[PDB]
Write a protein that binds this ligand. Sequence first.
Ligand SMILES: [K+]
Ligand SMILES: [K+]
Ligand SMILES: [K+]
Ligand SMILES: [K+]
Ligand SMILES: [K+]
Ligand SMILES: [K+]
Ligand SMILES: [K+]
Lengths: 230, 229, 230, 229, 230, 230
Amino acid sequence: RKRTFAIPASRLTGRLTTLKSDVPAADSLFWKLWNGSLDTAVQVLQTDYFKGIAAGTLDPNAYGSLMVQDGYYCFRGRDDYATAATCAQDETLREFFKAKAKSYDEYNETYHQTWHLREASGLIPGTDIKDYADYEAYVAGSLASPYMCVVMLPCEYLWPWIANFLDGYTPTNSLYRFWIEWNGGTPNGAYQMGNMLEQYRDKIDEDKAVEIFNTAMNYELKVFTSSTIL
Amino acid sequence: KRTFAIPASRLTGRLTTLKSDVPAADSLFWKLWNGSLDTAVQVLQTDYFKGIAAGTLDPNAYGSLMVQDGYYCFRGRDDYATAATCAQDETLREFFKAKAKSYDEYNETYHQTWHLREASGLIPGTDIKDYADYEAYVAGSLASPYMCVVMLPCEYLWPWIANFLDGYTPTNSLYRFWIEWNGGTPNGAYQMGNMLEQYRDKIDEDKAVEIFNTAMNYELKVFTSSTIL
Amino acid sequence: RKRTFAIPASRLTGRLTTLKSDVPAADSLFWKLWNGSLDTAVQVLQTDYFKGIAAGTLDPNAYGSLMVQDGYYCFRGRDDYATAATCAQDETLREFFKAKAKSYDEYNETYHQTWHLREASGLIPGTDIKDYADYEAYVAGSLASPYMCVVMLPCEYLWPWIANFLDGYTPTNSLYRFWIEWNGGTPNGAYQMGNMLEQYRDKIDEDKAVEIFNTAMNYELKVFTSSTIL
Amino acid sequence: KRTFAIPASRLTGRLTTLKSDVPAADSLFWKLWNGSLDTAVQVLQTDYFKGIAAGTLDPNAYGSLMVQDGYYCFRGRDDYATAATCAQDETLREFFKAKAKSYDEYNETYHQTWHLREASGLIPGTDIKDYADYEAYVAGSLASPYMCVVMLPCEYLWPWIANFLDGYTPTNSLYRFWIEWNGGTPNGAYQMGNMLEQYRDKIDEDKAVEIFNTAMNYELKVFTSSTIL
Amino acid sequence: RKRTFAIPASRLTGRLTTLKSDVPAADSLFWKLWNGSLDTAVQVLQTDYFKGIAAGTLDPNAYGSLMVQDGYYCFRGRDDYATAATCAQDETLREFFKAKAKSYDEYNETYHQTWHLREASGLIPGTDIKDYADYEAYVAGSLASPYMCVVMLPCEYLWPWIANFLDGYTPTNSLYRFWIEWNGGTPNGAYQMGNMLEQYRDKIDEDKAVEIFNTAMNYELKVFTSSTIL
Amino acid sequence: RKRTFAIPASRLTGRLTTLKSDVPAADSLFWKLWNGSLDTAVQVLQTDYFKGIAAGTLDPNAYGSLMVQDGYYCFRGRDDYATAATCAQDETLREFFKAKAKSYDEYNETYHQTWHLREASGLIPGTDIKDYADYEAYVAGSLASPYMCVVMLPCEYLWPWIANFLDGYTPTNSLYRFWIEWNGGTPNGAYQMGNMLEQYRDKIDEDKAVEIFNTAMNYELKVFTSSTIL
Ligand SMILES: [K+]
Ligand SMILES: [K+]
Ligand SMILES: [K+]
Ligand SMILES: [K+]
Ligand SMILES: [K+]
Ligand SMILES: [K+]
Ligand SMILES: [K+]
């Protein structure tokens, strides 16, 4: 129910035993990526979707339609981590990606059980979510391993960031307050992945990372924008 | 607008004279409904409908049920196609074919707004699975007119609930749309009631009562379980 | 304040010693009568009166004007049970009707004390309540004894049935929430009279009973309908 | 609209020139009102009127008091008839007769909307009974002009309260109708104040002050006890 | 922020040692003054200002603009008490006025610190507050000492009286509820000054006192009335 | 009571005849400055002040106390533009600064009339507003003319930007909705000044401009943060 894809302490084993979830350092690639896309994040806050969450007036049809599409996205994201693990040449990253896939499986129980969704092939994704998922699949299958951490970061950090921003704008007794509770708090999953990524910073092109990260951020905006157009 | 009525443009052939006016007081339609009214009242007593009226229904419950209703409607369409294929006579063949088409039109909402591809891509809850299975059994194993009986509850109950809850559901409240989409004159139900009346002498009314009551009770079970997440 | 006309345990004496208040059996005349008029009960829920109760917006003038008329009705009802006792077929029903009259006297203290109503003659009933009270007097004075249990059942069962229905529709902090509390709960008075009536089922014409019961139910609907037309 | 004013059509005979304009500042009318203004303020501090303004007055308290006000107004009408009978002054005889008729007209609300037949059919609470008994005493045992004194509070206090509470009582609130029914220009009070001024020299003003203050204090007592159920 | 100008027990020294804060006797000049202006107080309750306080809808710009003007008023009031001390030929009244000046200094810290107002000369008073402050300065500097107690009484008693009246009309969770809490309760300052005044009652003309008190009360009304006209 | 410091068409005379108020180009120094401080702007949205505005629950004392300090700030800002004009390095900037001082005079009528504030010397500014005002005076009097456009831009652009952000989070019937109406819409004043600045871009150090702009933005954050600490 708590939306997290963090690797829990019990599964920080093998090469992952020392992986930390503390806030990445200010000079990290994590913050460099996030700080460069902040204008996009602010635009997400200006969507009708999030104005609806804060006001408690989001059309429940918009909420649910988006949720089904997020199911599609998360089902495919799990598969992408599995693909990344298969493509990893580095054993640490292989273990990391295998653990992330498992974190997705656990979260995805919500989509199977509460939302009654069997699998991605049973859904007809909207254009934006399809394009976004296709992009992640391409990164996972065709680009070097550390870029997988880059492309998946926005969906792990943006949601908590939105929740923590909207917390003080969303009354405790309002209908979508649960969104804040389920997504807010410390973004330990994102931090964890940012700390993994920092270890491979010297093995990638940072300009390419920026482009990949910004593309995924733009997809988040497109998806939230289109979610209320029914 | 949730309707499965056959529109005027498709009342052709043997369906040309089929009417949508309120069935007569002595009709099998009202006999069936009247006998399950206690069940309908219990549907109004569900947390689901208290939540609709109050505007406080958990959006996760609303959506979770909607996905299952998609499953139900996809299978309902198939049941009508099954019933048409093995139909008795040509009037029912045409009627059931036209109903299947009305379901196809309505089901665009599940495909487009709710992004659901097909029934096999969903994992139904137990109650909706058992209900759908029961309608499939009626369509494929019982005489044709019983298909009108088993499908009538979903066509009449929903507008009836909406028309009841209309004056309890403020126009500015979050789930007011449910009243607007489901309420008004239940022309689809009446139309099928009027079709059924023409085959009344060809069925066992005790059996029809049992079938109708089973379906009504599935509606209650589905709405009851919808808010237990 | 608790609206009940049940005979309490302390007055279940003599021939009434073994009279029970448990739910009548499914094949009882009680359920046969109620089930046949359920469409009318649903229409009572559709009145502006009950929409107003649930929403907390019923005009206090409508609430009060109907209450005065219910005082008239209950004052007369008490006399109708006294009349029924006087005409009673047999000693058990004589005792039952005497005990019911006393239950009415006990409840009617609310009309004397809180509503400042002296007696029926001091009120000018509306048409619907007058007709309804006239019908009950007719049954009490002109028809066989067990029919008195039939005609009086709607007012004992309908009101708790309405309260129990509207309970989950009427917020606990709303202005007419008291209606739910005062009228809801187990309809023991109705059950008790249903159980009395079952014992005389063979002594009456059930079609005539249905007719009488449905007339009373229809008067309840007419009264609630007219209550908000001021 | 709660008014006991004598309408223009019945300002005939000796009443032809009676005016409803605001009494002059030096009038007995204002002298009486100004001396009891603390009591009027305490009426505004009752739970009754705090409930009116907030929309939260218990409907049972509202109704319970309304029945008692019916009793009071039925009796008030009889008091004016008694005052007409006992008046040897012709103008006051006509005035009281016309006031009795104004009460009859208003009292149709109690007969018709509240279904109350007559005073003898009601059991007044203690405060209302004492207040009505006091008015009946003034009407039947004191000099005629004192009747104008004792009846003024109920005619002026209620509009005054309504006009005070108007900006405190939202237009959409449940008891807003109280403001609309009782508020506006207190023409009936002014009319009686203007009648009273003409007999000022024929009464003891200290006694008038006592009588007026007694009635005002009964108003306070009645409103205070109305919400203790 | 508790709005009081009372002389606290610690400063009831010298000739003020025995000065009491109990409710003045019914025959006191204090109550004579108040009772004669009660119509004006009622009209203060009829202002849009207080209707706004009770409803929680007073324009925050009206609230603040008036507060600045009240700062001006209180700064000048403090000066008036110092002037009155200077003109007092009676020693007890000299001490009383000096102590009042100090109570104003203490209260006035709210205007310096919270509202960032330096001094009266830095403000541009509206016409009504200017006129009212000018009238108090005139009384202080040109009329016999005890009249200063008369002219300053309305601002000490009227506000608590209003707060205590509106308490039961102002929900505890409403935006301006603080007004009630800061001004309401026992008007000990007013009572104290009333008790001081009563000792000099024989030294003044009561008709003149009525005139002065009523003038001040009328200014209070004018000020509250104009406060919401922006 | 529209908060604008734009030079209106009627005063676009002489060297200012062709000065435009269109949105500056994407490559402009104006957007470079704003884009670099966006994190600070987002932190302004996270203050209790703006959460209060949106929710309608901002303490009216906090609202008003800040308004008085803004009066101080605007009184001093007007003088800074007069100073900048006096030591303007060319006639275009002299005319521009003179025109801005006049726009400030026009807006400042709200502080004199509605808020009853005579002049800056009559106010005691809080620490943050004092430091901010001192910084602008320093820029005006000690740095090259075009830097005055830089340091004044935040107060002209940030407020509209906030209002336009909060518009869809602030219900139309809420108590502080007027803040959105008064500050929101097209930031024509800011654009106009950005377009003036662009003409002097080659005459200044952009790194210094960034520093100055960020300092002012940070003062805005400090001021809003401290406004609700009473
Ligand atoms: K979520
Ligand atoms: K599938
Ligand atoms: K629906
Ligand atoms: K009577
Ligand atoms: K009334
Ligand atoms: K100054
Ligand atoms: K230019």
